[PDB]
Every structure is written in C-alpha cells, then in structure tokens.
Amino acid sequence: STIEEQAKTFLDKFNHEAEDLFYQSSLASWNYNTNITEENVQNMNNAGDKWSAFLKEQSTLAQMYPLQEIQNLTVKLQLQALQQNGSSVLSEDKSKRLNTILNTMSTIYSTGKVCCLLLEPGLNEIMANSLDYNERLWAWESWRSEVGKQLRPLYEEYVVLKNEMARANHYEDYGDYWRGDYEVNGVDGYDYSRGQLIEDVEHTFEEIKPLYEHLHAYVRAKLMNAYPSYISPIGCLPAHLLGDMWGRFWTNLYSLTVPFGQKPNIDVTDAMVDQAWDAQRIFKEAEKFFVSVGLPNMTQGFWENSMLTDPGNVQKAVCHPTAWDLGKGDFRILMCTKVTMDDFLTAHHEMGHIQYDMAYAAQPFLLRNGANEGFHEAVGEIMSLSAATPKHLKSIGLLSPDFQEDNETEINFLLKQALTIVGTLPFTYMLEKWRWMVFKGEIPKDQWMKKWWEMKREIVGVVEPVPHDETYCDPASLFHVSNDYSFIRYYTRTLYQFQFQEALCQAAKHEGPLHKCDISNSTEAGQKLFNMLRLGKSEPWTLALENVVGAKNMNVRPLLNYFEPLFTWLKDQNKNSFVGWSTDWSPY
C-alpha cells in the first residue's frame, strides 16, 4: 500500500485522540478561568502538560512519514504542521537557557518598578493624562532607565538562541519564523513564500504613509496648544508627550485634538441603560444581529455553560472579553459584561471569533484554525465595525431621530480611530522591521537603539526626548519583544478588516464613504463571509482573500476609502501649520 494510506491512518489515530485530550486540558482551564484557585491550577496544569507530552510524542512519531509521497495535500498540511520540531531542535542546554531567558524577561516585564510605581496602572495612567513635560519625561525615561535596564541584557542573549532555532528549523531568521505562517507553498498562482511577506507590507506601508503624515502634522499643530514650549512645528513628536508612555497610541490625545468638538459622538448607551438591558439582553441582541446577518443561533448549552456577567467577589475570576472554544461542540463566552455599547460591540467582537471557531470546526483538529494569524482577529472586529454604524443603531431603535450623523460628528468619530489605528501601523511596521533587522543581524547589538531612533523618525516621526544607549532598549521595554510575539498581526488585521469591509459593503451596495455601511439584513454579505470562515487554515488565505475581496494580494486602498472624509479634512486643516514633519529635530 501507499505512504498516503499509512499517513491517513496515523493522522486519523491522532485526530480522534487529539480532540479528546485537548478538550480535557481545555475544560480544566475553563474551570480555572471560572474559579481562579488552587487544585483548579493543578488539574489545568497536569492535563495541559500531558497534552503537550502527547503532542510532542505524536510529532516525534510523525517524523518517520515521508512527506513527499502524500498527494492528498490535507494529510500533507497536517504533517507539515505536526512535524515542526520547534524549540526541541535546540541542544537541551540551549533549550533550557533560552527557556530561562524567556521566563525571566517575561517576569521582569510583568513586575518591573519605576521609582515606586508599577507599569500598570501607575505609568500608563500617568502618561494617558499627565500633560506635564516634567512628569511625562520622568515617567518615559525612568521606564527605560529602571526596567529597560533589566530587559536589554537578556534580549541580547535571547536573539541568538531564537536565531539558532530558526536556522535549525530551516528558517532564514527568527523574523522568518513568524513570517512562516503567511507562507503559501506548493500551489499554482496562490503560492506566497515566507520572504514575500516583507514585500507588499512595505509596499502598502509606503502607501498609507501620507494619511499619517497629514495626521501627525495636524496633531502636532493642534497639540502645540497643549505643549507650546515643547514641540517644534517642523520636528518629529517627542516620544514622552504623545498620550502614551511608548506613544504606540495617540488615542488619548483625542479629547484635545477634536476639530469639531462641539458635536459629540454617537451613543445610545443612555437608552439601553434607560431601558435597563441586563447584559443577557445584550447577548440576545447580539444573537439577533448575527441572525440579522444570517449567522446561526446560539446553542442551548452555551447560555448556561458560559459566563456572561460579572460573578462578583463570591467567585474569584479574572475576566475580559474572551471567546471560548473547548471542542466537542463546547462553545462558551467569558465576560464580566456590563451595560454599555462597548460591551455590546465587544460581545459582537468575541462572537465573531465564536463563529470562526465554529465554521472551520468541520476541518480536522490541526486545520481547525484561521487561515492566517491575522485573519482570526480581522474576522473578530468586522462584525463589530459592521454593527457600530449609526444606521444600524437607528435600526436598533435606541438611536433617536434627533442628532443623526453629519460630517462634523463623523470627522470626530474617524479622528479617534485614526489616533487608534493609522498611528499604530507605523509603530507596528517599525518594530517588526527593526526585529527583522535584529534577527537578520543588519545591526550589531550595540547599533540596535541607534538604528531604532533613526527609523523612529523615518517611520513614526517620533524622537528621543533624552537619549538612551546600550544600557536601555525602547523595543525590549515593550510586551511584543518582552513576551516574544508576532506583532505584524496588528498591521495585517487592520488591512484585512477594511478589505473585508469594502467587499462586504459592496455586497451590501453601500453608498459613499464606508462609515455608514451596514451589513444587517444584507444576508448575502454574511453568507459570502461565512463561506470563508468555513475553510480556515485548510485553504490558503491567498485564496480566501480572493473569495471575499478578490484581492490576491494585500491592499490598503479600502482603508483610505474608510478614512476618506477624515483624510479630506486633514489635508484641508493641515495648512494650519507645516505639512508633514521633518527628521531633523528633537527637543534637546
């Protein structure tokens, strides 16, 4: 008989075991998530450890199956996932050392003190609000100067062992390791090798850039009301001033930078509080919304088995909006949901992940995942964005006919989004590209911070208010470094969200800028999306993006058609000062 028969039977003997043992781990973890106490810990641990030891054994057995003879592809794709050695390719001493480096630098970032203040809330809530150059500069500098002190020496040794596992896993760098997931291979036309992810991302970053250059120049010109003595009209923006301690979001500057601030944003939480919707009503409205999209109803056990409301002090449990899939058809949500429109839209956000985890559940275990790391998050938000629009909120009835939308309201709306989104894509590509340079080694370990504060000016337009050196690291002082995360997800999530938006709005026959697009009652837009959710990682994302959008490669023009009137008024308002920014200034 064939190896394909041999591989089929092995993977069948995997799948039926994997779905059971993974469930047992996942149920214990839900119980711990439901009851953050001991014994729940140990039961969660033991089951997850034994699941890992099963998964490592199966991966070790999968090595004896010669991949090239399989023509089924789907068997091949499960093998191509299972056979990945990961960290176990390292020498055990290097595996143990990197494991220690990971655990330690993660713990420092989880525990670092600025003197004293912890990172959360102490520094975050200062930098969102201080508006004092002296406090902000201290709170910025000391984070590098007291905790960056500790993360940088460990990051220098993390990079090499990560590159060593990348090399031994036949990646070109440990950036390519994360780039590996976007790879499409072995397909005519749809193929998309690991390095192809450097292209298009830089091609679209250079394309979104003008909208951010006009935002930065408007924000700078507007924020000089707040920081007249501290900001140059021509220079970059000082990294301490910008509403965050890293500056990765300007969203806190919104309250100062609204051009038409005498026109409040749209909200209907007051009518929902008036009508005393009880969170369970909100998930009921979320179901009726999905039903209005044509997505199926909640399953019976979900309603009691999930946690849809704050348990109170009588049941100790950390809680945040969290789609839960356990397998065996066990779907749940955990959220301490409360009576707001943002709990409502985050209920929609998590329910999108519930739908994606359900639709590809028809696939085998390893293929029960999104077609790429960013597609899962894009799907999450697109059912939030579709429901956020005032047109839908009028269909919700909670929006009065009084104070319908207008340009003055919607520019205020889009501005905060831009300070939340198009301000972050520079920072996202910045770190991911600088990480590509570190893991490739374009810059030795002493150049890292010097190249950083060059590219921060080219990419983000942000500058060191006081200089820092090899005793410091602004990158390693942030989660996605200190916790070893693929960060490009944020960049790709954003573009897929608006790419899917334009495709769904075209199906909805939307009119004008995409801010007033609504997908409810346009059932075809939901079914056109659902047929992509059904595939997940079983089929290339370069095909699923063709199925939804038709774009066989990444496109950013739909985002510019979402921000379209904001970009118009940025250009119109920018001539309040210099347009864009220059690299050649910092406060000192």
Partner: protein, 198 residues
C-alpha cells in the same frame, strides 16, 4: 401505534412499508437491533449510506424492509468525566456485510509493517471509546438507536394486528363479520349449545 404515536423520538423512518400502514399488516417474525452512537453518527445509518458505522460497526442492506428509530439518551448514559464504556470500531481490514457482527480485536495495520503482536507505528488497536460528557454538544451526545427488521417467509405469520372489535347489535337487519366469517341477516339469541371448540 403506541410507538408511532409516542411523539418521543427525534427520528422515525420506515422502508419497504410506509409507517402509517404497519398495524394493517402481518409478518412471519420481526427482529430488533439496538445500539448506542453519537448524534453526529445518526445520519450515517440508512440503506445506501456509508460511514464508520455503516462500514465497520453495523450495516444495512440497500433493499432493507423495516424501520429505524433514534433518540438522544444523554440524560441517562452520559456522565461527568465521560462514559468510555461504549466502544466503536475505528478500523477494519474490510467493510462489514449487511447484519454482520464481529467483536474481534485483532490489530489493524497500515503500510508494510508486520505488527508482530504489539501496537506501534501504523499498528493500532481497532476500537475507540466515545467519552460522553454532559458538557458535550448534541452531535457529541449519545443516541439510542433501534432498527426493526420485518420477516416474510413461506412459514405462517406469527405477529399481527391487533384487530379492532366493535359493538354488538341485535334484531335489526345488519351486515356481520364474525371472526372472519361474513354474511348478512338478523341476529338473535338461541337455546342450542355447541361444544366448546366449535
């Protein structure tokens, strides 16, 4: 009728005879086949169908005459931690015949690897347990299935009916149908005594 009217089954199918037309029929014998499967498997069992049930556990003839019942048994044979006392064959070297049964546990093999008395690389035990837990979704919940097979033979019938009796009436001219005897007339009481078997 008490089955047809029970209104307590999630599926009811009949083959070779329509389900309404069953009490008005007789058979040589009947046989009832019963087992437990997942709800996700319930869709596998029909004449012509295929699946782990139809291939390796229980198989119908494509000319089946009879009926099929299922209902969700979750509330009496699922349990916390799961019920693993219910087993299905995952592999067999060949598919079953209609109404074949084989419990044999001889190791299954894929590729060229003589298993020589142990499981291993592509040598596997051919049976799996479900693990029915009350947290499971309904497709992963258990169902009790019954299949009724109807026999017709050169031998006489033994299962029938039941027939319906009706009220007696007297002195009027009527049509009468007594124990399969037919006629018309007036009925009246009589003095003569038969023997007890006439």
């Amino acid at each position: 009728s008490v089955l047809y009217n029970s209104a307590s089954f999630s599926t009811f199918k009949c083959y070779g005879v329509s389900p309404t037309k069953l009490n008005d029929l007789c058979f040589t014998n009947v046989y009832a086949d019963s087992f437990v499967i997942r709800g996700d498997e319930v869709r596998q069992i029909a004449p012509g169908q295929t699946g782990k049930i139809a291939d390796y556990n229980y198989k119908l003839p494509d000319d089946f005459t009879g009926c099929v019942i299922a209902w969700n048994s979750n509330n009496l044979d699922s349990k916390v931690g799961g019920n693993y006392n219910y087993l299905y064959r995952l592999f067999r070297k060949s598919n079953l015949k209609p109404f074949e049964r084989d419990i044999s546990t001889e190791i299954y093999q894929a590729g060229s690897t003589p298993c020589n008395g142990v499981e291993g690389f592509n040598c596997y035990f051919p049976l799996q347990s479900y693990g029915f837990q009350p947290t499971n979704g309904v497709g992963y919940q258990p169902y009790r299935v019954v299949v009724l097979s109807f026999e017709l033979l050169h031998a006489p019938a033994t299962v029938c009916g039941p027939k319906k009796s009706t009220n007696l009436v007297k002195n009027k001219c009527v049509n009468f149908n007594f124990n399969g005897l037919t006629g018309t007339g007036v009925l009246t009481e009589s003095n003569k005594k038969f023997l007890p078997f006439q």
